[PDB]
Amino acid sequence: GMPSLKDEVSFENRVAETHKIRSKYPNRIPVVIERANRSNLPIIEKKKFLVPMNMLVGEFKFILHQHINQSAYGSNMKLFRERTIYLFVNNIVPKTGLLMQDLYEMYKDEDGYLYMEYSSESSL
């Protein structure tokens, strides 16, 4: 029951956002990242991604690991602290050898977004 984009933006606005972003950029998928448990993992301020359709899940997972563990340390600089992260799509582990389009086609939310979650634990 943690705070998400659904609580921030109405269903009708989200549908409109994703529809026009998908018409404008048909080769990219809209992804929102959400924190799924309470731990030492930080809440990322930027959580909306427009991911190339042919990007591998394993590749996007690598990118997402870094993002979650990086914070701004001024201009030209980012501080990276190593932490173990587990990633989830619709409560399951994203399959590393798939395309990000596949995840989108399989687990896309009715509002048009692919919702993905991170946790410090491997469970849910």
Partner: peptide
Amino acid sequence: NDWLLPSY
């Protein structure tokens, strides 16, 4: 209106 655009 902000999106991150990841690359390879």
